[PDB]
Short mmCIF file of C-alpha atoms and ligand atoms in Angstrom, two decimals:
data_model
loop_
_atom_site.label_atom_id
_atom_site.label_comp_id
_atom_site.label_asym_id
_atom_site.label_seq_id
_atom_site.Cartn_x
_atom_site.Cartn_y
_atom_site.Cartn_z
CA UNK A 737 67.31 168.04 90.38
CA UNK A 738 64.69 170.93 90.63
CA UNK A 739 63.06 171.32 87.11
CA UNK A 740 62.71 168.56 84.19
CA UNK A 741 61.40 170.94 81.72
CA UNK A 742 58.13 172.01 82.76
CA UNK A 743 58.11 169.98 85.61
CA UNK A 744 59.01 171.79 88.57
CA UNK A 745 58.86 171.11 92.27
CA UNK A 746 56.23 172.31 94.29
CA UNK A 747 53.29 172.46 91.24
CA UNK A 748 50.61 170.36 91.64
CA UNK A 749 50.20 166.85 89.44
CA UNK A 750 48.63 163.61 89.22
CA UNK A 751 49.72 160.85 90.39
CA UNK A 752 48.88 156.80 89.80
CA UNK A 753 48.34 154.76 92.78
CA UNK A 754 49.06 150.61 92.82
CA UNK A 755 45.09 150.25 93.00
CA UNK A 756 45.64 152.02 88.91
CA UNK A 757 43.38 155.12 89.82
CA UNK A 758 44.76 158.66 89.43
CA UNK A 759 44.78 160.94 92.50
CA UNK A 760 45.38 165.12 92.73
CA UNK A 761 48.67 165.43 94.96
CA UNK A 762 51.90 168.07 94.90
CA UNK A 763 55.05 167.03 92.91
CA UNK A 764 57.96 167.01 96.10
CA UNK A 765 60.74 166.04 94.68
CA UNK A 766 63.02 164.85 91.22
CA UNK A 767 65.57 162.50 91.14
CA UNK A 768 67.75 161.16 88.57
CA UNK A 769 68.29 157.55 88.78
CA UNK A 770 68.93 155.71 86.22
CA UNK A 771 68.83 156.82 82.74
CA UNK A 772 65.70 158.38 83.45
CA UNK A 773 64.75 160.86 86.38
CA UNK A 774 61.57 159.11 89.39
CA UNK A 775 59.23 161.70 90.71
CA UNK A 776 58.15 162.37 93.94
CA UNK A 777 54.48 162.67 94.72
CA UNK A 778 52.56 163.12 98.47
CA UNK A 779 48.97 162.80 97.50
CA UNK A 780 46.95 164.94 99.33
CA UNK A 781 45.17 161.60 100.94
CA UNK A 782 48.44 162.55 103.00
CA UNK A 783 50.74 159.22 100.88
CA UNK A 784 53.85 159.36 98.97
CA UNK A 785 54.97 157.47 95.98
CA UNK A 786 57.88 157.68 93.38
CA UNK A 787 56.97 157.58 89.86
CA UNK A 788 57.92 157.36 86.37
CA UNK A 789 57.57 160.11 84.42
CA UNK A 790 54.98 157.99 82.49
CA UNK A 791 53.09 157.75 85.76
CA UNK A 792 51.90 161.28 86.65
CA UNK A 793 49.71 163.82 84.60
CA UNK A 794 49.37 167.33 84.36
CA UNK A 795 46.65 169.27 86.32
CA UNK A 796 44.92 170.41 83.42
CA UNK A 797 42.90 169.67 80.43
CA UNK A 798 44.69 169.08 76.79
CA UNK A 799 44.25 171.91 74.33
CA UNK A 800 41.90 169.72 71.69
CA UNK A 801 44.04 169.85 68.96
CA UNK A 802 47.11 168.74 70.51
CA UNK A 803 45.62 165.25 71.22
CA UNK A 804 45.73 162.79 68.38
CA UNK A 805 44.56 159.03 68.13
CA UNK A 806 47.29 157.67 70.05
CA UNK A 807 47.76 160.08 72.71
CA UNK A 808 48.29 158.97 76.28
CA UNK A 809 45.78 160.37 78.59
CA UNK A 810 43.96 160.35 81.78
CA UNK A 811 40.41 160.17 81.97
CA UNK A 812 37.18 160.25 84.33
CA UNK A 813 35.26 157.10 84.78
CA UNK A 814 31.23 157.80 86.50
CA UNK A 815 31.25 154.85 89.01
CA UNK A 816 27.53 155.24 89.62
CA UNK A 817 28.07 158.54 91.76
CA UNK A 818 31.82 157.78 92.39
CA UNK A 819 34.24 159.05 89.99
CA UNK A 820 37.57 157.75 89.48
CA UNK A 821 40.97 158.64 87.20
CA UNK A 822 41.69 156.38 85.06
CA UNK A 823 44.16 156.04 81.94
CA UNK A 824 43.74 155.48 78.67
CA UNK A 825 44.29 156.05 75.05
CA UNK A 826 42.19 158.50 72.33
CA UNK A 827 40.40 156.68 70.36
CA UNK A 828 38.53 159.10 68.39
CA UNK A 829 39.07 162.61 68.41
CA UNK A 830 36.02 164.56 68.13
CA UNK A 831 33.65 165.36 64.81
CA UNK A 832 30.16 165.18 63.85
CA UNK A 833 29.27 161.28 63.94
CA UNK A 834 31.25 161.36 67.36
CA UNK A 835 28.61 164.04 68.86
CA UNK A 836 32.04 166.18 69.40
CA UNK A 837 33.41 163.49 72.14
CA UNK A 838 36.90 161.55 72.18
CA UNK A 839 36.83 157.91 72.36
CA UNK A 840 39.01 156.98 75.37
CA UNK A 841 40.16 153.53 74.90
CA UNK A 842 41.34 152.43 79.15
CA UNK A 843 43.95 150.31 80.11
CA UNK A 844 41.74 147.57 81.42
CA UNK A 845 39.77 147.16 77.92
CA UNK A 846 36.36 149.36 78.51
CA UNK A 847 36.23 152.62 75.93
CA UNK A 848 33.93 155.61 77.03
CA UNK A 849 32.96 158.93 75.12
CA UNK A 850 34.36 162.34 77.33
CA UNK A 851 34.85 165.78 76.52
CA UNK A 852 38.08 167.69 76.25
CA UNK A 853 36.96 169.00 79.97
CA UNK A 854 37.29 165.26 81.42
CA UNK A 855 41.00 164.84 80.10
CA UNK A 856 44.17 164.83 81.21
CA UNK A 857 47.55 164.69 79.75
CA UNK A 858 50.34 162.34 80.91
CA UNK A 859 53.57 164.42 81.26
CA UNK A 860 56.28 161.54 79.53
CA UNK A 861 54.75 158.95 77.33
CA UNK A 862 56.85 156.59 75.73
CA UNK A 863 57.47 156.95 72.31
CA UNK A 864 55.17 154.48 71.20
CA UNK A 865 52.46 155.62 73.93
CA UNK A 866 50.82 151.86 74.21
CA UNK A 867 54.47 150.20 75.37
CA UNK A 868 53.30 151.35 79.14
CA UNK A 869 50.16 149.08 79.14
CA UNK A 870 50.55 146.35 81.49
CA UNK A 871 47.66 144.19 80.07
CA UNK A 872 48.81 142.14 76.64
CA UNK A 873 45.85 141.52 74.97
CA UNK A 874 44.86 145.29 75.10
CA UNK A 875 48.87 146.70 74.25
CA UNK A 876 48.73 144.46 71.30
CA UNK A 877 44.82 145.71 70.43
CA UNK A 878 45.58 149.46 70.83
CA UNK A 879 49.25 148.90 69.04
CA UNK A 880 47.43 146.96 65.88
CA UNK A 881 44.40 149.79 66.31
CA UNK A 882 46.69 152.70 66.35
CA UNK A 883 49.01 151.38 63.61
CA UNK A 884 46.10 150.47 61.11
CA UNK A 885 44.24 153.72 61.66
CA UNK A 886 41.80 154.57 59.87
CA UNK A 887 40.93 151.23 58.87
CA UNK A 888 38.56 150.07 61.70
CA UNK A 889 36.32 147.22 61.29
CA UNK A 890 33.53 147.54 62.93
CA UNK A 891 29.89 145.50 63.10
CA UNK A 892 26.86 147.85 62.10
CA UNK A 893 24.07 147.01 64.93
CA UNK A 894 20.90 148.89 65.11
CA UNK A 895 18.69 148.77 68.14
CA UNK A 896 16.87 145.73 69.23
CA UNK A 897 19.26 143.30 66.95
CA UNK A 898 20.13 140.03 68.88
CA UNK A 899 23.42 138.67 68.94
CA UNK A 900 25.79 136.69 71.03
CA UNK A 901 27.63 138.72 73.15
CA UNK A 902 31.12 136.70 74.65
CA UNK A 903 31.53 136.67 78.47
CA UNK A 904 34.13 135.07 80.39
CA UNK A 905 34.56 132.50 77.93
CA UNK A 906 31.19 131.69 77.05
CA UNK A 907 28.60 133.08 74.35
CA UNK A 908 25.45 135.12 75.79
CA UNK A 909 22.25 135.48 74.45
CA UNK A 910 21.88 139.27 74.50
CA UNK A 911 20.30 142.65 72.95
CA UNK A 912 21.61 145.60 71.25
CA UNK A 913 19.85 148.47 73.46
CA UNK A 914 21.21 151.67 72.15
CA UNK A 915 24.20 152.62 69.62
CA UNK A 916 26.45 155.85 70.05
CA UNK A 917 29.19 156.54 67.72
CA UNK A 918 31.78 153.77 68.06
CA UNK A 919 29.99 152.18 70.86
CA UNK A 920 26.83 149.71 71.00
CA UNK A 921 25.35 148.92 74.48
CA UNK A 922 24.09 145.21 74.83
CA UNK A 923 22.28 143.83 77.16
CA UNK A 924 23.08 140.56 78.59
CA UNK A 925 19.69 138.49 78.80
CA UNK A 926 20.30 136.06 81.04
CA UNK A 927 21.61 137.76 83.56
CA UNK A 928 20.29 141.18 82.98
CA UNK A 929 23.59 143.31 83.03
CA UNK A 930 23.89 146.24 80.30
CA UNK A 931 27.62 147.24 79.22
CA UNK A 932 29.13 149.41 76.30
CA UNK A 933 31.01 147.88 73.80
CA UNK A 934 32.95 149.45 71.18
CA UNK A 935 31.60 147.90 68.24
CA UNK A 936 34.80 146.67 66.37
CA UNK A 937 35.05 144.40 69.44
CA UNK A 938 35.17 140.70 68.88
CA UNK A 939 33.22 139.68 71.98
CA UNK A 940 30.47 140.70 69.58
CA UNK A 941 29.68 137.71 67.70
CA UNK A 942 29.43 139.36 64.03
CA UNK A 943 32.85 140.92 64.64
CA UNK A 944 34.06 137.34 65.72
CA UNK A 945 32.93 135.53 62.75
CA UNK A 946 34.09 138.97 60.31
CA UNK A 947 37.73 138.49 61.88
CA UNK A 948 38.04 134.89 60.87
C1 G09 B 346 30.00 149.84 83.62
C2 G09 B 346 31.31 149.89 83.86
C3 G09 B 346 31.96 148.75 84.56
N1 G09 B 346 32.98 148.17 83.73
C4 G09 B 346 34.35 148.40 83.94
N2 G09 B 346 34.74 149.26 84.98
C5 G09 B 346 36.19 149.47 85.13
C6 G09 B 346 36.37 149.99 86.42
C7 G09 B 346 37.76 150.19 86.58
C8 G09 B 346 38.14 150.59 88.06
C9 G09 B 346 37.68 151.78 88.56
C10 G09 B 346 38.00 152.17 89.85
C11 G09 B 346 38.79 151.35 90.62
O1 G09 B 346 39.16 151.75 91.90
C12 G09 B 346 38.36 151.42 92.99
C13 G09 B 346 39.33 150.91 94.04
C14 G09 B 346 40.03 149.75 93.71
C15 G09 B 346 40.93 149.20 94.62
C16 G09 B 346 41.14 149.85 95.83
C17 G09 B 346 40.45 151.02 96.16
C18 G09 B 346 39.55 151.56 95.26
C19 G09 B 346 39.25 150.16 90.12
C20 G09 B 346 38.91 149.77 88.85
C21 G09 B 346 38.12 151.35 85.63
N3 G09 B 346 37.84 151.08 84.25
C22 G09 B 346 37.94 152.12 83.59
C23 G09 B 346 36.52 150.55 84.08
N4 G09 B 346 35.41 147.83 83.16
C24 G09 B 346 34.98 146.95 82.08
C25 G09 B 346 35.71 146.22 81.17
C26 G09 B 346 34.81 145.54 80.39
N5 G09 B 346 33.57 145.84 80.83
C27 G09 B 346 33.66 146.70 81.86
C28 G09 B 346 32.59 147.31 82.70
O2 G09 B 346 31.44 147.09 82.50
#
């Protein structure tokens, strides 16, 4: 093959690596195998990779307004002054309580507030667009989140509440340090780390308790 729909060799696409970040590369090649069609990709870190159509993005941001809680996306992380691609799932699309962000729930469980400038679309999602994610406890979260929508439980924390905060397996003394939309950051208090949380989380201890 040459073209599957709008995807057409030569453009330029994103591509997923086996370390799960995203990478800008040219799209060299489609092949039918299977019942399904494999994509060719040579990053432009000079590597080559075949991948599912689930597996590659588009080069551009969403129109707003096509996305929908549920939609399969790709997303910038700020690693301190690195930035990676990572993907995820809306959340949230954007409105006033939201300060006009999306919610993008990752892969790997952390959620993050972007902008529709930060996004970017993945070309074929399956059907039910969580069935790609290879970590259980977060498919079966983001299937039961998706599915209930718009009943979300969450806790109500205001800042400088204390609560236990759970942490590989054990309960932490910790702080609520600042709230934003769907998403509390605590502060561990032993060991000093912050991290965002989205607040219908049941590490958070009231959420725990609430869901039994
Ligand atoms: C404050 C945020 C930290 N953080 C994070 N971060 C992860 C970082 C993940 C990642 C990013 C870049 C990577 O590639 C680097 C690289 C790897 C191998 C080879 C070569 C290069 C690899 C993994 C991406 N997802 C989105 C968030 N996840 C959670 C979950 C609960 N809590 C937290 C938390 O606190």
């Amino acid at each position: 093959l040459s073209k599957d729909g709008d995807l057409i060799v030569s453009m330029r696409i994103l591509g997923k690596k086996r370390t799960k970040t995203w990478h800008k590369g040219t799209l060299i090649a489609i092949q039918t195998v299977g019942p399904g069609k494999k994509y060719k990709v040579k990053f432009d870190n000079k590597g080559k990779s075949l991948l599912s159509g689930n597996h590659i993005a588009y080069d551009y941001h969403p129109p707003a307004d096509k996305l929908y809680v549920g939609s399969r996306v790709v997303a910038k992380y700020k690693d301190g002054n690195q930035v990676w691609l990572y993907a995820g799932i809306v959340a949230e699309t954007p409105n006033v309580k939201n300060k006009l962000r999306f919610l993008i729930f990752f892969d790997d469980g952390y959620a993050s507030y972007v902008t529709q400038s930060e996004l970017y679309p993945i070309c074929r999602p399956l059907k039910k667009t969580w069935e790609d994610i290879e970590d259980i406890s977060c498919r079966d979260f983001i299937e039961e989140y998706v599915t209930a929508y718009p009943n979300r439980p969450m806790v109500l924390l205001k800042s400088g509440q204390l609560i236990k905060t759970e942490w590989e397996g054990t309960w932490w003394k910790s702080r609520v340090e600042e709230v934003d939309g769907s998403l509390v950051r605590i502060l561990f208090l032993d060991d000093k780390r912050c991290e965002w949380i989205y607040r219908g989380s049941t590490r958070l201890e009231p959420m725990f308790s609430m869901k039994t």
